[PDB]
Amino acid sequence: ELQKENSKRWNPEIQYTSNFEKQTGVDFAVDSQGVYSEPRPIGTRYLTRNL
Amino acid sequence: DGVGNASGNWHCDSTWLGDRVITTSTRTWALPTYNNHLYKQISSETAGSTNDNTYFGYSTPWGYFDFNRFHCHFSPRDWQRLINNNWGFRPKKLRFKLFNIQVKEVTTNDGVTTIANNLTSTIQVFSDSEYQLPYVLGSAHQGCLPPFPADVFMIPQYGYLTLNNGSQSVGRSSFYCLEYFPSQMLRTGNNFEFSYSFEDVPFHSSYAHSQSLDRLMNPLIDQYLYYLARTQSNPGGTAGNRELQFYQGGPSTMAEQAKNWLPGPCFRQQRVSKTLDQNNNSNFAWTGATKYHLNGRNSLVNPGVAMATHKDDEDRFFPSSGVLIFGKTGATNKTTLENVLMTNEEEIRPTNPVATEEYGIVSSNLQAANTAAQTQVVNNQGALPGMVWQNRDVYLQGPIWAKIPHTDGNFHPSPLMGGFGLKHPPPQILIKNTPVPANPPEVFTPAKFASFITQYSTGQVSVEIEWELQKENSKRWNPEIQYTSNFEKQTGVDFAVDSQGVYSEPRPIGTRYLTRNL
Amino acid sequence: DGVGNASGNWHCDSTWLGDRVITTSTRTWALPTYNNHLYKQISSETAGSTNDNTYFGYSTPWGYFDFNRFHCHFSPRDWQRLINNNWGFRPKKLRFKLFNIQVKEVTTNDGVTTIANNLTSTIQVFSDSEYQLPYVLGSAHQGCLPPFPADVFMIPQYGYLTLNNGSQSVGRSSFYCLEYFPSQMLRTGNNFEFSYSFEDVPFHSSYAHSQSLDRLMNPLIDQYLYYLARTQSNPGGTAGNRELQFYQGGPSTMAEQAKNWLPGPCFRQQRVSKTLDQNNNSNFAWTGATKYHLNGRNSLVNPGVAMATHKDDEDRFFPSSGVLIFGKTGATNKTTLENVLMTNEEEIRPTNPVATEEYGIVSSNLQAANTAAQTQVVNNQGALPGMVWQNRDVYLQGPIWAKIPHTDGNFHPSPLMGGFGLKHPPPQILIKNTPVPANPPEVFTPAKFASFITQYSTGQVSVEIEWELQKENSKRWNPEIQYTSNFEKQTGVDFAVDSQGVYSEPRPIGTRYLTRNL
Amino acid sequence: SNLQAANTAAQTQVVNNQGALPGMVWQNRDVYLQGPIWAKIPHTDGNFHPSP
Amino acid sequence: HSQSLDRLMNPLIDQYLYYLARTQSNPGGTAGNRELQFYQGGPSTMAEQAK
Amino acid sequence: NWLPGPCFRQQRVSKTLDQNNNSNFAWTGATKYHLNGRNSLVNPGVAMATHK
User: CB of E30 within 8 Å of any CB in chain B?
Assistant: First the structure.
């Protein structure tokens, strides 16, 4: 069950995003040998809210 | 609904109806233009304040209405009725109105100022009934409806703060435009209205306990439980050798008896006397205070956990920052002791620990044949299974409610200044003058418009609340303590005006007069 | 409907409802008197402009409303929602209102200016819902509803141009009187309204392709088709004699494989670097530009066919006139490079050719035993059977729509600045102050009346649009690129006000963030 | 830590641990794509804010 | 959260509650003798305010 | 995921007279609380285990 956000913030928020520049491999994919890997940890607290 | 028609009447009244009381209030307000119709970023850089005082935020051109004080609704005679005859109370319903709107334009010239009516200007009002804006109420700010009904008041300016790193902002700072809401526009001849329901909340305790927590036994019978009395049986001299002796519950040894209930938590503060030749010759209002620490900043614990002010026979003492302090009539922001009014929470001495003393004593080691026992003083203590405690009182000139912060966990969410803690409190009402531009040039310019006509507005406001009463059901035989007026002659009446026309309140009035068996 | 009654409320909001989003906006305007209630003929003779700049037209006393920009309707947070979660969108319905009208008279005297209310003056509004007047919108003019809702704006003056021969007119030049239309007159207490339906139009592509057009094969298998590989079989030395050798589709030779689809058309422009010590020491902003030729005049190709800005690793380059350029906060009309904001169309590199490079190579002759082969570089190319291409992106601070010219033929009528091309666009709304003559003489004169009272008017405007969303349906396993805010500390917030009260937009924001398999 | 007087300076003590006090508000720990989802609360007589 | 717990006030208005500011009123030198002085909630003193 | 309960540590006393210290500490070295200027033995208090 999802709880949707209902914010009146005027300016844009912080969002989780992928890399933009060139690398040797893709994050969250396999390498030339067939091994899956996860680069970093990903949390959940990106949107904001008035305490 | 025109220029020559009133859109509301005056309603100031009180109606006691058994288990309910209904109050109604009406006042006259005035609203200037704030910030020149601009939003402005504010910071602590202008202040040159310290790291603890560092802040980053915004200021807006809107005002807001504030009636979060008991004297906005109760007159002193009504407060006396309530606190002398009831054990508890709480709010039920609210109703709000704005009527008889007037808008004026101001022209200054040659040092002569003129004022005329503007019949076609509007104002903008809305309620934040979904709690999307920062809730700025509930911080004990000035700008309330005045206690005396014949007084005219000025509406305060609205602003807020967001996250900062020094005098900087961070990527999580939020900016808010209030014009991004739906508002209702009012010319003269229009009015505004809304109603609200209070969620279910506990009654405020308007009583004092008439027993103490360590004296809940029968003083004539003994107990069937033993306690360790002696360890070194001394027959009279130094020849006392080891022996274990256990006693039986007795009336004289009230303390040496099994109990069932502990006192509440503590956060021990510094003691300060009302005698300058009793306090230490040093400045320790900040270095020796009680603080908390959050994100590299310090902040005074003010007022904090509800504790008793002083013990028996020690009324001249008080904690550094553990009481509410109001000011007498016409005081400055920087003031001495004979011009302030301090409260007393010494009616909760039966259950809550004294603020300036320690909680208790615990052990620190394990004694042996050749090691004496050791103890350690407990100057702070959180919740333990078995604890009971009271809350802080409310005053005729104090706050009514606070908004509980939306978090994952809280613990006993009573606001520490006193009042009713609400997850969905009465919403903020914001009001503004609609800008009227002066004459623009006759050739188009994209430059930002900045020439305006000076305006302000005035009108009437009313607010009405229904409260639920809890009546007392006591079998006390002898008479009780009651709040009462003076009997002897003075120069003036308390809670009235003087020869110059100034209203004043002499003392603070609490609620805990009737008693109750703990 | 009187002097003391508001005829509308404030409505600024957004409502996301699944496959639709509805936006609403309200602003405050001011309208001066233009031209002294006169129509005037204008020409390039006063300018002393060149043959290319020669023009002949008219100017009118009417103003007009303009909201053909995305930030008139979307706030930056809403634009972020839209571009981070959707593959496409398009407009559906429109609604327009004008309310709370106020008219004022201005008296100047002794250097003292006074302003009073005129309760019996009117204004004149109408919509050109049959498209009989020249459509002046859709040329990226200033005079829009401001991006920040708390800003007051001035309405622009309306005029148009017709056919000219130098600074002269010809027998086919058209003059237009706007009073020759039916309008609606509004005193204070009246309001105005109309609605419109958008014709059926394609969704805007809010995605970037994740494959390229020359890489649509399987990289493990070979083809069943041969291509000519060698012509002079060289066994290692200069003794190579004639021989025809054909190869088979291989993974290494991706380019040497039969395909099915060509890139789009091109109109190759000049390359300009962001390094002054990399650009040539000469002025070539006009002599070496890309132009078209129409009726003896030249005109810059600006911005023109949608092409990619730069190739890989070459982000410091850009075409001379092949991108959109906005200005930072508070810039003049003549400006240097560190005060402008340039866009990047490099996300259409998978299908569209780079702007500053050539299309391809073709042959020029017929080789023989004693004639070497020759080629020729193709710097321009129209449509060929097999071509696929993308359109230019839209920006939060760019235009929304354009009117397609009524002609006999067009080709892919997407407007070259970006947006939705419409044969029946939202009509122009024109507004004017009704003239109030001063006191005439007391003896009749046929001479033309020329004494008027100075007036201007102010009021509120609102506009509401409903958009249709196309949701994304992707099976990508790894995460996508998303527009995001800064994370570290700065002095101010992006898309907010500074300490002086000025709103500003730091960067341009496009729409192509999510991806899609070509 | 003490009670100051005319001839006694004030003293303090640093609080390195603290349980629940009336008035406290707090957040919980975040969850991660590669972390646990749930835990079983132990069957006892009392708990306090049983978030794992 | 986009606000902090010690910054939930309005930064333009003052409070109607006093706090103990000084104990040894120093007129500038070492001749400061005992005196109790109470202040009023101010924007600069965010920490010195009832919460 | 789970911590033990609260504590109010008390003095240890052995059932061997030649193991307990040669002194009377049934009141001076006890565990008390303080309420309105009076002291009172914490008896029995928070539920804790008797011995290890």
Answer: no
Cβ-contact C80, C483 below 8 angstroms: yes
Q: Which of F18, F29, F40 sits opposite B242 (nearest CB)?
A: F18
Query: Encoding tokens for residue C279?
Result: 């650009």
Residues B137-173, buried b or exposed e (16+ Cβ, 10 A)? bbbbbebbbebeeeeebebbbbbbbbbbeebbbbbbb
The resolution of the experimental structure, rounded to one decimal in Å, is: 2.7
Would you say how long chain C is, in residues? 518
Helix (H, G, I), strand (E, B) or coil at C79: helix
Pairing relation of β-strands B123-127 and B20-31? unpaired
User: In chain E, which residues have their Cβ closer than 8 Å to the Cβ of A51?
Assistant: 1-5, 8
| A43 contacts chain D (CB < 8 A) | yes
Q: Is E46 on the interface with A (CB under 8 A)?
A: no
Residue whose pair of structure tokens reads 């609200």 in the numeric block: B196
Query: Look-up: residue for tokens 């956000």?
Result: A5
How far, rounded to the nearest angstrom, does the alpha carbon of residue A35 sit from its chain's CA centroid? 22
Contact between residue B431 and residue B32 where contact means Cβ atoms under 8 Å apart: no
Q: Is A32 exposed, middle or buried (0-12, 13-18, 19+ CB in 10 A)?
A: exposed
User: In a mutagenesis test of the B interface, which of E38, E39, E40, E49 is the best target, namely the one with the most B β-carbons within 10 Å?
Assistant: E38
Closest CA relative to residue D48, chosen from E11, B72, B411, B386? B411
HEC per residue, B33-63: CCCCCCCEEEECCCCCCCCCCCCEEEEEEEE
C13 touches chain A (CB under 8 A): no
Write the DSSP string, C224-251: S-EEEEEEEE-SSSS--EEEEEEEE--S
- Residues of D with CB below 8 A from A38's CB? 33-34
Contact present, B353 and F34 (Cβ < 8 Å): yes
Domain count, chain C: 1
B373 and chain F in contact, CB less than 8 A: yes
C360 pairs with which residues across the strands? C378
Domain interval for residue C405: 1-518
Compute the distance between CA of residue B23 and CA of residue B75 in angstroms, rounded to an integer: 10
Residue ranges in C260-401 assigned as alpha helix (H)? none
- Residue-by-residue DSSP string for D5-33: BTTB-------------TT-EEPPPP--T
Within 8 A of F4 by CB-CB distance, chain B residues are none
Method for structure elucidation: cryo-EM
- Chain B residues touching residue F13 (CB < 8 angstroms): 228, 231, 244
8 A C-beta contact, residue B162 and residue E3: yes
Q: What's the CA angle centered on F42, arms F36 and F44, to 5 degrees? A: 145
What's the CA dihedral at B281, B282, B283, B287 to 10 degrees?
-140
- Determine contact: C482 vs chain A, CB below 8 A: yes
- C492 CA: distance to closest CA in chain B (Å): 6
